[PDB]
Design a protein around this ligand. Structure first.
Ligand SMILES: *[C@@H]1O[C@H](CO)[C@@H](O[C@@H]2O[C@H](CO)[C@@H](O)[C@H](O)[C@H]2NC(C)=O)[C@H](O)[C@H]1NC(C)=O
Ligand SMILES: *[C@@H]1O[C@H](CO)[C@@H](O)[C@H](O)[C@H]1NC(C)=O
Length: 273
């Protein structure tokens, strides 16, 4: 088996402006986002290729869960501002948590918070306890450890529930995270009035993202003039391109090359002037 990670990111603003939700949550599985939730619509919604996966999660229920998470989160943000006596200001609290497995074996877990961008508090499951980094965190810690169960629960969340959720999801996501969709390529050219002719090699509809794309001028690998790539989350696919400018009198042979993990051997696509 390989590496898999389940990450969540919560964002809360103490004085949100118009059109910006006070609370936002999102979740990822590896390099893809599978869900989202904000305090405006208050609904946990699958995203990307997960919008088509059935029976992996009861979104209606997970929404009740996010609403409850939101309440605690925003109360936390509220208490920090109350502590700095600055409710007139605009502040942010960000949370990060999740885990990762490698070869079906839990390989890591994390739970950390940031206030106005600085480390606020984080959970150390080995102790187990919260570690304050900011003075107001001393209060927060006192609250999250007011009963013996609490840390026990937090430790149980990272060591048992989270990795269980991740495994459950992997069961329904093989057709998503384990894909090896081969790249479709397209060589194209454009002549800018006054400029040289440029050739653009495009690799698309492929996954995983790791890919090798380069041109060759007479069997000679060229230095790209431009270069970019993108991940279309709704699709779960990448696109990577390269662009070379060609001398207005060059006659040499131009061919594009693509190497990807899903290919038994590299691909070549010459440009026919
Ligand atoms: C995945 O989504 C991307 C982005 O929506 C698709 O790319 C678009 O494809 C259409 C027609 O093929 C083009 O007209 C658009 O210009 C493309 N968007 C851009 C700017 O990248 C892609 O085709 C989708 N792949 C699959 C397999 O559905
Ligand atoms: C790991 O995968 C096995 C099958 O490969 C599964 O039965 C098990 O529940 C998973 N996690 C463990 C070791 O509990």
């Amino acid at each position: 088996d390989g590496r898999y990670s389940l990450t969540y990111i919560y964002t809360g603003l103490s004085k949100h402006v118009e059109d910006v939700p006070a609370f936002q949550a999102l979740g990822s599985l590896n390099d893809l986002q599978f869900f989202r939730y904000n305090s405006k619509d208050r609904k946990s919604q699958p995203m990307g290729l997960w919008r088509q996966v059935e029976g992996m999660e009861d979104w209606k229920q997970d929404s009740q869960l996010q609403k409850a998470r939101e309440d605690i989160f925003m109360e936390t943000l509220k208490d920090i501002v109350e502590y700095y006596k600055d409710s007139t200001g605009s502040h942010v609290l960000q949370g990060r948590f999740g885990c990762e497995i490698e070869n079906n074996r839990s390989s890591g877990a994390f739970w950390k918070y940031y206030y106005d961008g600085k480390d606020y508090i984080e959970f150390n499951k080995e102790i187990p306890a919260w570690v304050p980094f900011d003075p107001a965190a001393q209060i927060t810690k006192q609250k999250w450890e007011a009963e013996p169960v609490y840390v026990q629960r937090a430790k149980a969340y990272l060591e048992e529930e989270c990795p269980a959720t991740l495994r459950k999801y992997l069961k329904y996501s093989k057709n998503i995270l384990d894909r090896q969709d081969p790249p479709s390529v397209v060589v194209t050219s454009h002549q800018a009035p006054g400029e040289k002719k440029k050739l653009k090699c495009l690799a698309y509809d492929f996954y995983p993202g790791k890919i090798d794309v380069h041109w060759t001028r007479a069997g000679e690998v060229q230095e790209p003039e431009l270069r970019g790539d993108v991940l279309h989350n709704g699709n779960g696919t990448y696109q990577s391109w390269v662009v070379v400018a060609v001398p207005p009198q060059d006659t040499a042979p131009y061919s594009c090359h693509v190497q990807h993990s899903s290919l038994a051997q590299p691909l070549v696509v010459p440009w026919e002037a």
